[PDB]
């Protein structure tokens, strides 16, 4: 079994001014069933986060050790923490959330059939039968109830078979018969050699009789720590006799909460500093401090198994909530039909270039501004990514690449195919076969580079408010330097370097080089030369040298390697912004 | 006192296929302390939502009556419902959330000093002293703990002094000494004549002795309803003897949950249809059905008091989280400085018009695309608006106008002032005093009309992903018809009507009429006329004739009344999309 030890644990929270949650706290949690009791605000979820390695260590002032050695790197992949506020995906099902966490947190030497045989056993043992194929709700569509969602969070961290299991009040939201059935399941599990540390509120006497160790937190200090059977006899010596209460857990928390002003105002030298100084002078503290001195990432599944399940769960959210993908395809058709109907029948005339160089500007501007909706990719599921990363589900690189494919394929690749096809059979652009696919590839790369910039601004962010705003004003900034309204050669030298940062300038140049190269506009001529007066812009090549565009075949693909270097750079910024996010 | 009565209550939920949550349920809840016990998934939050008029009545199949009459329209402003999942604003404080709900749900005949004197009494009685001036947390920054946030939700619906109070498990998350101190506060409150209906999980024996009425739900049916003192003696006649349990609430839920598969698998003709048929033949059902047959918006504060508190709370969120407003002002300065540095020193030349008509296009394009960030104004607080509307805090029109002023002033009015000023002392536009303020007013109206369109697409929506996408592609659509790249007069008649829907076409026309009227460009002339050739475009009036812009003073303000009619229409769509939102 695992003997988790914690020695001289202090904590501090900056609100600046620091507040001392969790003063000097010492204890040992041997394999069994270790309960933490105490009032609300006592520091029970703070102690249980320190012990589960989920607090920022800048405020933490002690050492937690498993078996006398410090915590390994594969601790989240060997332990479980059921947290208090039930971070469950509410577009999946009770069985689907159990299928996801069994797939990524159990090793793949087990069959997918035998993984589901263990999911059925946990659904039966937790009593989730009538809601197993019913959706966990979100905060707008109700679904599964609060106690049935609580048992889903318990069961997701229970198929994984952890050796140390932490539970943040596992039976609040449960009734007195399901709460006893859950701790009798844990007591059965704890007798296989598991260390189970939990906090609990209002346990009944049949639940309290299961405890192997008792911890009593109040105001951040320890009122008692030791066995639960020798807990009632500890308070008899301190002047508190038991049986005005048939339940000892109702007796223990009437002592350590008598100083509370709710209890003093309703039906009724500090009590905390008196009860805490009794404990450090007692024999239970000398027993544990003379025992503490004797004691004093390699994920479960591979990268490709986690990549094939983050994207599998991401595609099921898009096939269940296909609002933004149907609306993407709908307003891409009616925009491609309108752009094709305005510039319908492009002539080779004196005004056939500003129609052509004005239609390829609105194709590029559309693919850039459509990518502002990629800001919400890592923002709406930030709480679920942070919870499931510290729980040991996946790498950051598995989640990052798996969630890319739910934004790359259905929102950027596919609406750049049907947008290129629609404005090709109705405009009359360069009619060859290769220039159709160069135009399709160019519209994809400005959709990928502008989406990678949407991820680089918005990764690791809680709201979309700063990121959408910096997304659109950076695209108005990149549209000044696109090379259409104001000429890039007449820009002064201290500002003309900003044209190399412009995503629309690379797309519009590659669309201009693909379209105008080999065209001729001056035919229709007289015995005299042509008879407009700029004088004339006959060849598509001389239009390109006026813009400053190279006529070599490198002058086309210079713009496609500069958009590929903007995809790699902006997706490395966006990856590291999720990697170095503070997830405590 | 209020005698709430519910008769033949049924419910149904479409998952399509219908599921019968809450079968035939009858009962009476007289002034006192009425508890609802039962297992998880029994239908306790569904009965407590039916009774509080928070369920969609398309599935509801009975009648709930207060004092034998149907409930009035001012029921949410006379009752209180503490819901289960603690919808609290986490950027405010425990005292600030209590100050907000006392200001909008207590009448203003009470002084603001005496409202805060009652807030201090509720903070003392609930034991919220050490966290009263500490922030309730969000899901990313922890703050107040789970039980201390639970008591904030209780206290917000308790300063209001409701006559009927519903509580959705008010003591889950509380410990056994604060849970007793909360129900002793309710028992003191219930003896003034209040009807207090609650559901409860795992009550101790001192809490169970406070109940005046007991209701036992299991799988949607009623296992018992009547007094709580005569509840133990009801199950003695049905074959269940009590004292293997010293707590009767632990005895009642071991009967009605013995059919649960968690209890059958752990330490161990249907039981529900056997226990439900015993009750309908009992004397407690004949007593209540022969008593049920004998029985069978005007907000608290005014519109202006609610408008001055929704905006007061909205400004405190912007002064506490000023990320998107500082970033708005920063990238408006460096964009106005870049636009002013590219077109620096606008000259009156042959190419001084496409510099001028190209700089007023990027000023209009910026004010439209900056307004995409107005999409999440009503989206990120949709759960808090829906909760606080059905709780009777404000009207929709109070919240709508109060939340406009947190998006109108700091994000659209102020960044259109400093954007107009910056590109005026460095460009050299129309140098009069009135044309500076016409240019400032024009940039404000395209920022208001484009933000009102951001609200019209995004009001009543849970994600910003569809609405940001339809925002930016509608602005690319409106930029084709702005009248710069493709000429509006050469557009065919079946497509040229779409130029009247274009917000940038109205702003850019009013910016062109303000700028070019009275300018002259052909000076610098010879003995010959000018000697470039298209031929020339000398006066600014003949440039405006070529664009198709009226030269009358109405031709300027035609564009400002068409943007004002787009503000009124898009803010009426956005208001009605919050008004007719299904908030059940
Ligand atoms: N990061 C933090 N910021 C502000 N306050 C904190 C923070 N962490 C802890 N606290 C405070 O410390 C006290 C204990 O916190 P904790 O969340 O551990 O309580 P708890 O014992 O779990 O209470 P409950 O049982 O009601 O959930 C609380 O009163 C809380 O307000
Ligand atoms: N809108 C809904 N969609 C799907 N299922 C529902 C819906 N409403 C109720 N249910 C189901 O009905 C049962 C009872 O729902 P309810 O939320 O009332 O449970 P409860 O008694 O409050 O449970 P708990 O005490 O655990 O919160 C639950 O099992 C839930 O799955
Ligand atoms: Mg807690
Ligand atoms: Mg409930």
Curated annotation (Swiss-Prot), chains A, B:
Broad substrate specificity ATP-dependent transporter of the ATP-binding cassette (ABC) family that actively extrudes a wide variety of physiological compounds, dietary toxins and xenobiotics from cells. Involved in porphyrin homeostasis, mediating the export of protoporphyrin IX (PPIX) from both mitochondria to cytosol and cytosol to extracellular space, it also functions in the cellular export of heme. Also mediates the efflux of sphingosine-1-P from cells. Acts as a urate exporter functioning in both renal and extrarenal urate excretion. Glycans are attached at residue 526. Changing residue 365 to F: No effect on stability. Decreased estrone-3 sulfate ATPase-coupled transmembrane transporter activity. Decreased substrate-induced ATP hydrolysis. Decreased substrate transport. The lineage of its organism: Eukaryota, Metazoa, Chordata, Craniata, Vertebrata. GO terms for biological process: biotin transport; cellular detoxification; export across plasma membrane; organic anion transport; renal urate salt excretion; riboflavin transport; sphingolipid biosynthetic process; transepithelial transport. The keyword Transport applies. This is Broad substrate specificity ATP-binding cassette transporter ABCG2. The extracellular loop 3 (ECL3) is involved in binding porphyrins and transfer them to other carriers, probably albumin. Disulfide bonds join 522-538.
């Amino acid at each position: 079994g695992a003997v988790l030890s914690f020695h001289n644990i202090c904590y501090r929270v900056k609100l600046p001014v620091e507040k001392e949650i969790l003063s000097n706290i010492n204890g040992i949690m041997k394999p069994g069933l270790n309960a933490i009791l105490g009032p609300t605000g006592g520091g029970k979820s703070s102690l249980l986060d320190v012990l589960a390695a989920r607090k920022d260590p800048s405020g933490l002032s002690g050492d937690v050790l498993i078996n006398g050695a410090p915590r390994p790197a594969n601790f989240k992949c060997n332990s479980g923490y059921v947290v208090q506020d039930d971070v469950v995906m509410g577009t999946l099902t009770v069985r689907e959330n159990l299928q996801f966490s069994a797939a990524l947190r159990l090793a793949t030497t087990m069959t997918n059939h035998e993984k589901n045989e263990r999911i059925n056993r946990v659904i039966q043992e937790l009593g989730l039968d009538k809601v197993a194929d019913s959706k966990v709700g979100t905060q707008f569509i109700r679904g599964v109830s609060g106690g049935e969602r609580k048992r889903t969070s318990i069961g997701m961290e229970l198929i994984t078979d952890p050796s140390i299991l932490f539970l943040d009040q596992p039976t609040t939201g449960l009734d007195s018969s399901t709460a006893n059935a859950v701790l009798l399941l844990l007591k059965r599990m704890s007798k296989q050699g598991r260390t189970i540390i939990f906090s609990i509120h209002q346990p009944r006497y049949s639940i309290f009789k299961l405890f192997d160790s008792l911890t009593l937190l109040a105001s951040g200090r320890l009122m008692f720590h030791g066995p639960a059977q020798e807990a009632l006899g500890y308070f008899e010596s301190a002047g508190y006799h038991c049986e005005a209460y048939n339940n000892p857990a109702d007796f223990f928390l009437d002592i350590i909460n008598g100083d509370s002003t709710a209890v003093a105002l309703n039906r009724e030298k500090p009590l905390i500093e008196k009860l805490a100084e009794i404990y450090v002078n007692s024999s239970f503290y000398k027993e544990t401090k003379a025992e503490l001195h004797q004691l004093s990432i390699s994920y479960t599944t591979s990268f490709c198994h986690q990549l094939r399940w983050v994207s599998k769960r991401s595609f099921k959210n898009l096939l269940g909530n296909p609002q933004a993908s149907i609306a993407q395809i709908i307003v891409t058709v009616v925009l491609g039909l309108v752009i094709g109907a305005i510039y319908f029948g492009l002539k080779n005339d004196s005004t056939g270039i500003q129609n052509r160089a004005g239609v390829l500007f609105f194709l590029t501007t559309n693919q850039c501004f459509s990518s502002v909706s990629a800001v919400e990719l890592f923002v709406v599921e930030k709480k679920l990514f942070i919870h499931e990363y510290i729980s040991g589900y996946y790498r950051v690189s598995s989640y990052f690449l798996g969630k890319l494919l739910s934004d790359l394929l259905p929102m950027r690749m596919l609406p750049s195919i049907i947008f290129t096809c629609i404005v090709y059979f109705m405009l009359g652009l360069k009619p060859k076969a290769d220039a159709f696919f160069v135009m399709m590839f160019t519209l994809m790369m400005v959709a990928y580079s502008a989406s990678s910039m949407a991820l680089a601004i918005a990764a690791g962010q809680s709201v979309v408010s700063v990121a959408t705003l910096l997304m659109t004003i950076c695209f108005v900034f990149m549209m000044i330097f696109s090379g259409l309204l104001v000429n890039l050669t007449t820009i002064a030298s201290w500002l003309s370097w900003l044209q190399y940062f412009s995503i629309p300038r690379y797309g519009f140049t590659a669309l201009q080089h693909n379209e105008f190269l080999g065209q001729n506009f001056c035919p229709g001529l007289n015995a005299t030369g042509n008879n407009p007066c700029n004088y004339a812009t006959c060849t598509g090549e001389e239009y390109l040298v006026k813009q400053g565009i190279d006529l070599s075949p490198w002058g086309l693909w210079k713009n496609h390697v500069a958009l590929a270097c903007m995809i790699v750079i902006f997706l490395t910024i966006a990856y590291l912004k999720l990697l170095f996010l503070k997830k405590y």
